[PDB]
Write a structure and sequence with these properties.
The structure holds 2 protein chains of 2 kinds.
Chain A (H helix, E strand, L loop, with lengths): L8 H9 L6 E5 L25 H6 L2 H10 L8 H11 L3 E6 L5 H4 L7 E3 L2 E8 L7 E3 H9 L13 E5 L8 H10 L5 E5 L21 E5 L18 E5 L2 H12 L2 H17 L1
Parallel strand pairs in A: 1-2, 1-7, 2-3, 7-8, 8-9
Antiparallel strand pairs in A: 4-5, 4-6
Helix pairs in contact in A: 1-8, 4-9
Chain B lengths: L8
The chains are: A alpha/beta, B little secondary structure.
The structure holds 4-dodecyl-1-ethyl-1,2,3-triazole (A1JK5) and zinc ion (ZN).
Chain lengths: 276, 8
């Protein structure tokens, strides 16, 4: 049972226009925010990955916050891909968006809390690391402490204050595992955009879907192959479009008949962001 | 003991 006629972006569009495609799940990564200024991935780091590991951070938080001040974007504008997911929401096709990103650009693009599984948390809020305190601090307080180059400390504990990001070594939120149990029994299409499926347990999500569910990858490189089956003789459902995410979403929107909708959405929302 | 953790 192959639900796609051709293993191409146009085949995915035609399948999305059929009545079988009612519930679409988006799995997105850093590649969908690179065109917005968010980057992809002296202090003597024992290994460069320790900058995002919770044990080292609790021991030595200065490198992380220095990097945060260095790479903090001056503006937060969602990309064409974010607004493609917004169009999916507006048309009743988006069951869920699982994101590895912490830039909150899905929220700014208009996806509500129920639409989202922020699998790796958010930079928007921060908390005291003491579990008996958990004093919450907003992004303004955190950004002030980051740019004044003062290590964020709790007013009650004097303990370290960490942004609500799932560092390497921390458990994912329970909402991830609650949504996953229900969402993938009913999913009709997987849209994997801007991720090379290198972080677990997020990557495993691509194997939770039913075997007949088509899966489209829009990414600068093929990924998730054993599993993704793009280029074998047994291939029947996995399509790979290689390039920038904005270009792939433009092409898919045009093939679906939504070119002008996506253009208007992007223009108006960017104007509204520049207005405030 | 804990929920699955973010690993590379
Ligand atoms: C296992 C969970 N997990 C987390 C990640 C992402 C690691 C990179 C974090 C980047 C922090 C950027 C700080 C500046 C943000 C400005 C808005 N992968 N897997
Ligand atoms: Zn505290």
């Amino acid at each position: 049972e192959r639900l796609l006629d051709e293993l191409t972006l146009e085949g995915v569009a035609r399948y999305m226009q059929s009545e079988r495609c009612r519930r679409v799940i988006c799995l997105v990564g850093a590649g969908i925010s690179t065109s917005a200024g968010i980057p992809d991935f002296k202090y003597h780091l024992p290994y460069p990955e320790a900058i995002f590991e919770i044990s080292y951070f609790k021991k030595h938080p200065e490198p992380f916050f220095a990097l945060a001040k260095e790479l903090y974007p001056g503006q937060f504008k969602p990309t064409i891909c974010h607004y493609f997911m917004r169009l999916l929401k507006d048309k009743g096709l988006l069951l869920r968006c699982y994101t590895q990103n912490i830039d909150t650009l899905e929220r700014i693009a208009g996806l509500e809390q129920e639409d989202l599984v922020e699998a790796h948390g958010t930079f928007y809020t921060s908390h005291c690391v003491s579990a008996s305190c958990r004093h919450e601090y907003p992004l303004s307080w955190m950004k002030e402490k980051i740019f004044s180059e003062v290590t964020p400390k709790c007013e009650d504990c004097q303990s370290l204050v960490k942004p609500d990001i799932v560092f390497f070594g921390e458990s994912l939120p329970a909402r991830f595992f609650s949504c996953m149990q229900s969402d993938f029994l009913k999913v009709d299409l997987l849209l994997v955009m801007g991720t090379s499926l290198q972080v677990q347990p997020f990557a495993s999500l691509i194997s939770k879907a039913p075997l007949s569910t088509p899966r489209l990858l829009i990414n600068k490189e093929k990924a998730g192959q054993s599993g993704m089956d793009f280029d074998s003789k047994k291939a029947y459902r996995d399509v790979a479009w290689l390039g920038e995410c904005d270009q792939g979403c433009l092409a898919l929107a045009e093939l679906l008949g939504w070119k002008k909708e996506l253009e208007d959405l992007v223009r108006r929302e960017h104007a509204s962001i520049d207005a405030q | 003991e804990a929920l699955p953790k973010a690993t590379g």
